[PDB]
Design a protein around this ligand. Sequence first.
Ligand SMILES: Nc1ncnc2c1ncn2[C@@H]1O[C@H](COP(=O)(O)OP(=O)(O)OP(=O)(O)O)[C@@H](O)[C@H]1O
Ligand SMILES: Nc1ncnc2c1ncn2[C@@H]1O[C@H](COP(=O)(O)OP(=O)(O)OP(=O)(O)O)[C@@H](O)[C@H]1O
Ligand SMILES: Nc1ncnc2c1ncn2[C@@H]1O[C@H](COP(=O)(O)OP(=O)(O)OP(=O)(O)O)[C@@H](O)[C@H]1O
Ligand SMILES: Nc1ncnc2c1ncn2[C@@H]1O[C@H](COP(=O)(O)OP(=O)(O)OP(=O)(O)O)[C@@H](O)[C@H]1O
Lengths: 472, 472, 472, 472
Amino acid sequence: TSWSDRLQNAADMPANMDKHALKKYRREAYHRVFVNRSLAMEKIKCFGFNMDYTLAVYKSPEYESLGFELTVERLVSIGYPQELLSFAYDSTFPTRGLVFDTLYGNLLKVDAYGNLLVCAHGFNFIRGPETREQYPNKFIQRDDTERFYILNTLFNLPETYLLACLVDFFTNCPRYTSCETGFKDGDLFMSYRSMFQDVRDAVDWVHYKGSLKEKTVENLEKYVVKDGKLPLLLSRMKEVGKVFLATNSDYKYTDKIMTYLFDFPHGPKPGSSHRPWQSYFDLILVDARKPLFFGEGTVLRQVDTKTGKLKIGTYTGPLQHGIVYSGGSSDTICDLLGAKGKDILYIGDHIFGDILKSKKRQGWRTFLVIPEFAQELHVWTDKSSLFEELQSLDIFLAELSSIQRRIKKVTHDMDMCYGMMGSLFRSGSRQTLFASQVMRYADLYAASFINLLYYPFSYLFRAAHVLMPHES
Amino acid sequence: TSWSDRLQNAADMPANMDKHALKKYRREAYHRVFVNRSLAMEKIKCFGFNMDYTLAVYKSPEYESLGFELTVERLVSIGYPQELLSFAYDSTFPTRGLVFDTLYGNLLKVDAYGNLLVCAHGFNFIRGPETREQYPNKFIQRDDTERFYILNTLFNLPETYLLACLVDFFTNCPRYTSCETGFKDGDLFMSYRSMFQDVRDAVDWVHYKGSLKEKTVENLEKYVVKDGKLPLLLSRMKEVGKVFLATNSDYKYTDKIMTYLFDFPHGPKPGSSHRPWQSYFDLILVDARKPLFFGEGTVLRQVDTKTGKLKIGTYTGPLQHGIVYSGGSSDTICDLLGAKGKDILYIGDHIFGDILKSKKRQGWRTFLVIPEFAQELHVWTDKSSLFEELQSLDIFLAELSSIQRRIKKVTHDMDMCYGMMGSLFRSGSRQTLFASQVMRYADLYAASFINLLYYPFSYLFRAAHVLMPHES
Amino acid sequence: TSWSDRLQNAADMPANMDKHALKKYRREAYHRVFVNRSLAMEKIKCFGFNMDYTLAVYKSPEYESLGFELTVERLVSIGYPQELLSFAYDSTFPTRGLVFDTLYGNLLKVDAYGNLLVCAHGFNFIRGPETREQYPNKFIQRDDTERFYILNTLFNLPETYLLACLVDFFTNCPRYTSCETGFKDGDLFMSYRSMFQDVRDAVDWVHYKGSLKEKTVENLEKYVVKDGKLPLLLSRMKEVGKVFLATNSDYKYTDKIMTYLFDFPHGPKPGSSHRPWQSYFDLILVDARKPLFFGEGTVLRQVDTKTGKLKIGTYTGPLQHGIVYSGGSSDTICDLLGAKGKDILYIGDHIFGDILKSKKRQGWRTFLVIPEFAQELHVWTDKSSLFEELQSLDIFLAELSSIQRRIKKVTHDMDMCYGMMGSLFRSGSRQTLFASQVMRYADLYAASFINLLYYPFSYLFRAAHVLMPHES
Amino acid sequence: TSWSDRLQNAADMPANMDKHALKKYRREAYHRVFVNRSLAMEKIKCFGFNMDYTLAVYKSPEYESLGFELTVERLVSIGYPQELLSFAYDSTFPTRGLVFDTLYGNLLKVDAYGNLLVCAHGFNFIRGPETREQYPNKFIQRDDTERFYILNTLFNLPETYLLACLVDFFTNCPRYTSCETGFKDGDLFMSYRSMFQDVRDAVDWVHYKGSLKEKTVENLEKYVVKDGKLPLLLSRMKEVGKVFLATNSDYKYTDKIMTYLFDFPHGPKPGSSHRPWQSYFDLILVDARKPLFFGEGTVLRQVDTKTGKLKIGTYTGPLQHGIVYSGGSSDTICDLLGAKGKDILYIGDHIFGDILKSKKRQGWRTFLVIPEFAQELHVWTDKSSLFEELQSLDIFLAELSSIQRRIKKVTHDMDMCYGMMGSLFRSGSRQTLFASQVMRYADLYAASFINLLYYPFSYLFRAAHVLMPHES
Ligand SMILES: Nc1ncnc2c1ncn2[C@@H]1O[C@H](COP(=O)(O)OP(=O)(O)OP(=O)(O)O)[C@@H](O)[C@H]1O
Ligand SMILES: Nc1ncnc2c1ncn2[C@@H]1O[C@H](COP(=O)(O)OP(=O)(O)OP(=O)(O)O)[C@@H](O)[C@H]1O
Ligand SMILES: Nc1ncnc2c1ncn2[C@@H]1O[C@H](COP(=O)(O)OP(=O)(O)OP(=O)(O)O)[C@@H](O)[C@H]1O
Ligand SMILES: Nc1ncnc2c1ncn2[C@@H]1O[C@H](COP(=O)(O)OP(=O)(O)OP(=O)(O)O)[C@@H](O)[C@H]1O
């Protein structure tokens, strides 16, 4: 049971729009919208979306394995050894949000302060004392972006695992000599940094020049979650405000995916005429180039929706029915829809490029979709006893040696229930950088934005006020 | 009664080192150390200090008025109108941490998200609806550092007030025509941006080329808080670890100020031989150039402590008794003291240049001194009824029009008890950017670091664990 | 008769190595090496080459027309109008070295000071007075590289003509409205700058992702000059020094072209065994990335000459027989060959990326190949009477109105003998930027480096010393 | 007899404005204007000047020694050793235009290609073979501006000598150990780079914060050449065009110097009423900040000519009689005077900041004043026999070992007649970078712009056309 199994299970259920059924449904944690800062939904005048892993949730582990397989094949194609073909994607290893240290070739799980929570070299999980040789302060400088790469997105899950496979493979292959910063192969030296760049380039290649999109579109049922409640919720949003799409993907791929997402023998509700996906949007913008989109952006272009090609020149005209934009900036959207930032609820899955940047650069309201959250929630509630014991040990240790070794043991057993790299949100009692960024920049979050269907449009999402220590 | 009156009052009390007297003393909020993240003092091996507003707390409002007067005189000296000489510093106007908007000439109090809490043009406090003409989303882009300047330090309190005096003066003087972005004076246009730069340059000039330091040193009793408990606490720190000074000030001024701070007819305790201030430090570093200090820093130099001049060349030698450094970097300190970041408690007053940067760049532990906090605490406890009523109104409004107008009225009455720009930490129920940065980057904070004297060196400072909404 | 016709004509002649025959052959201007700075050939220890338009001279106008056709087809493929397919390359329009002004859409021929010599908007040649509206000082700022693009290479001849075709087409097509800085097409605006970037991108695409290389290699006799004297001269160079290749092209294409260049039923001389092209080189380096090559360069890689792919990792080994390098820097070559800069004669066709940069960055000696020079020389000698009359008019005008109008008329008639954009080297009595860069940075120049065959290896190439006005 | 002795000698002669006397006077080389590019004076509509070493020629060696003495005193004041006070400026050592190599501490005389002509470490002149250890290719990369500093101006003559004094002093002082890149002094290391920066900072300090200007103005007869022909030539320029001043100096100093320059008991000619210096200028601009002046420049300000202070704000008004500008850009001048670049003859002494930059950035016509040229001309004509012998040896050596050693010997004897660093313009038969920049960017040059007085305003300055080798 993967996280996308939970989501597709909830997607196969028709929407019971009885007012009592909704209030009861959103009592379960899997259907709730969780709130970091209070948000009065009645003030939202525009609902904005990205597409990938938000409207189009790619099924797991099939999609990650496809991306992994095509990336491995690209690396072999450019000269990596044939043994890469023996790799097989393993969804229990990677957790999202890890940091690859290109100097020493380690995957790191860190908190918001750069403190080390987990350190794996290949598949070898390095314990505290051994990490101090490379990390004397158990700490990394997050601003050293040349050295450290944060694997933010679900698209990064294949390469997260692949980086560890590669370090593991070169380390244990007798043709290579392991050095502090890479591998020696006779008169060739492969640094972890250049290896990382090859992987990163191959993932980009797979997405932009390879066959990933083609293989996705030829088997959409295998790769993309489909939910009849999606047209219903969007149609309700359009009744109370405006709806826009702003995706980094190109129009041809967006058209294929969105057509599939809306391919039901009916419109918003069973019994209604089917409507094209574009009719659900007041504004459609592709090739957004987020997060640059939230600053100067790029030149605003017009898509020829017949050919899927850009028309030649900068588009200077108005928002017209049927027009599709390419590029532009977030100001394009606000001007064309007559919106201010706080009028907008932007619904995305990229913690940095969608949520952090729209919040900090423009003061948009934010809803973070966390696709793995359906599975994380299941583990969290099933193992809440382990966490509670952890909280008790920390309290008992505060009043006071065998307690500290028991804290590490419970922490490990809890973390392993999530996978080898632990929970997206914490390791034991220590929060991750990702958890901290969610809390700070996502006003609302959930496994799926479809959970908004279970709340009335006048709903006041409420968070407790934050107080300083001296104020409480 | 200024905030420095509270501090000097607590400074005139001898230290009662009875173990029960300490535990009782630190029960009062004015003597507590407040905790944002747990910190086991037994792990601290090095105590580091800045000097200005930490070891040398400048008395208020005398010091701010002196800085104001010399800045006004410098501006008049370079050609500003004689009417500036009629200005008089007013400590009830400025609050620290405001943002000057150089485009429109406004002082802004903002939260961590750039939302507007207060907007004053000159001395005219602009209400919500009128601010939307210039701030359509009631929001500023904090990354637009060319436009927005954050007035972080107590040294910025004179210019905070002076900026408002100047906007007020040019606005109401018939020789000038007010425009959106500055003032027209015939064939001369003075933008708010160039006016701001003149003020900023004049404050720098006053500090580096003017008479401020000279006038301070000639009347240290008037301008600098003096506390016999300072040598005692530093001496206790040196018994359990190492002690270092890292100040942006030059050696000649540091020597004068520190000599005064230690000028008692005794050493750490009454009855003990007096010791020179330098003997309290394992490492003394001046001209630190923080925050660059916490990255590449500058070339490490050696001070000739006889002449107060730098010796010629880069210093390549070891840490020797009596040596004084200039420049260098935070790595200089860690290498020379054999410390890792988390071994260090760095005690400073600059939320950005001392605390944020040492935390994020180096993983140092941090203690933020907030000199005005003595007065803020007094107002907070005296007016806790107003805040409680505010909390109740927000709760009552959440279950549900005359409540919202009452919320704004209580918010104003509460804020005015702090001064015209309100509390350093909030406006009503909304936290400031400064409060958020304190919580995120200051592990400990207090009105004075002397409050550490009331805690044993094995003390475990404890903060509650942070949980995400779905985890609680 | 194109310039490559002259070259291939001289290539079909076997080499007469009789000492008197050589001295007599190099008396004709078409076989001379011309000298800007004295160079003692006996001091040259390494002969270095680029490949494109130096070793592999592409036949004209066939190769330019092929590049033009594929670029037009790429532009139409991305959405430019079908009328582009009616364009046909015209070798009489473009001269190399013109500057495209992306602001106003003009092709400019300039001198080294940025003075305007010729200005064409589309195919409309703008006369002096009309150019002053856009160029008030008849002058462009050459450092404004965002605005002005210098079309340095023969590869730029197709796009030189295509830019003029496009400006001409959009200007005279009634669907578009001509504006100062581009064309309006309803709600789309196409600036000259974005049009230029489309052209530039399409030329790059044609070379790197399109079919240009493929179409060249499938008909090498049509597209590439072949000369049996090339293996002979290289073999003689290797007898007295070292020989290296440093090309921006990739190994697969280099191998195909060079194999063709050496595909004779014999080696250096008729009767000798054929040798593979690689045997003529002590060092072979592809993917050079000049001019960055002459600074930090890129990571040094090793080519797997079986697969044509790079081996994985940085190459740390020594110069071995049969090894082929990729990337690296000019220091790679100097270290591996044990050469200092002035030991090296580098033979290239890129006035900026080969000659200027190797001279200024490294102090290499330089030989500039100018493929069109064979034709320019023919016109120069045939029309020397027109130039002489021009020199006389300038002298007569200096002793003194109908003379000035006659100077412009002779200047035009002379220039048109070269083509519509005149001589590569001048317009009338005014030298071009290209001529000035040749004189300053090319120690030697000729239509072909094969002209070195007509000089003994001890030859002292001599240039007259330059004197200041007061020194003569 | 210094170069300023020649100039002041020619300045003490009244102007004989008889038409025949002028034509005869400008036959002597000392009164000629030398021509690199033809210039029709009738086309010049604006004459522009800098002040320092152009209008105000500082007497030699008195002014250089004053600058040297104050710089040494500043260095000692900040901690350099007392032995510096034993230095005495020596005008026979420095030549203008040398390059200080901050890596190895050498003064270099180079040609335009970075080839080494002279290399002195301290006062030790390093011969060819010994220079190859540090300069393997006898070549420096001129674009390595962090390493190499070109000493362009006469203001740099004191520090040119001082750098050599310092290297000499530290090398031969037993307290210091000489290393490749600087000097070790126990636990202090002084790199040549930081030593150079101290010198550069001290020269700036002397000019901007020290007593150099004050000491100059208190004895103007000692320090500044005064010529009654200066008001006459400027008055004649104003009769045929406009005249402007654009100086990097401030107004207070400009006013003092210019008042002295015009302090005669008469105006342009004996017998005429004296006029204030400002009346000779249509436009006066101080604080120009050249060469940035020739790009974006700085904010245009207005000088209050009563107080010598800037008025507050940007000046938006028109060119008015009596107005004085500060800052701005070259476009300010062109707009206000209604001039295009080629209408302007700009007369300056800074080969880079005045001449090169105004030529390349704006297409101004240029006149380079070379104050030492009066003395260089004397030596050139007196030793023309040595140069002729040198030319003969080079020719004789071209037809062909004892000739080459005789070429070096004649080259040395010729160079030493100019000073220890040889001629500004060459070393033997090799031209300097400075000579090359003069030829390329100075349309006209002379020891003084006063030489323009000997030419009628319709004069056509003529230079021979430049031809490529194949064109002649
Ligand atoms: N999740 C992320 N993905 C990619 N880049 C990020 C992410 N978070 C931060 N960055 C960027 O990485 C750089 C270094 O981050 P740094 O920790 O210095 O600042 P920060 O993110 O503001 O830290 P904090 O979380 O303490 O606010 C910054 O430019 C920041 O914008
Ligand atoms: N108190 C401060 N004083 C001066 N500069 C600051 C302060 N706080 C942040 N900055 C700097 O101002 C710039 C813009 O801040 P921005 O809000 O973009 O990032 P941030 O400070 O990381 O935000 P956040 O508080 O959301 O983490 C950044 O370079 C940041 O480091
Ligand atoms: N033929 C060329 N092709 C491409 N870029 C060039 C060429 N010639 C010069 N450049 C670059 O264009 C920029 C602007 O040239 P600019 O005229 O400012 O300097 P320059 O080339 O040194 O001039 P000069 O010819 O007077 O020496 C510089 O960075 C220069 O290196
Ligand atoms: N006399 C000078 N003084 C100061 N800087 C200079 C001088 N001459 C050139 N420069 C600057 O130094 C840098 C390096 O010069 P470089 O030799 O790379 O270019 P260049 O001056 O165009 O050379 P060339 O003389 O061959 O045209 C450039 O930015 C150039 O503008």
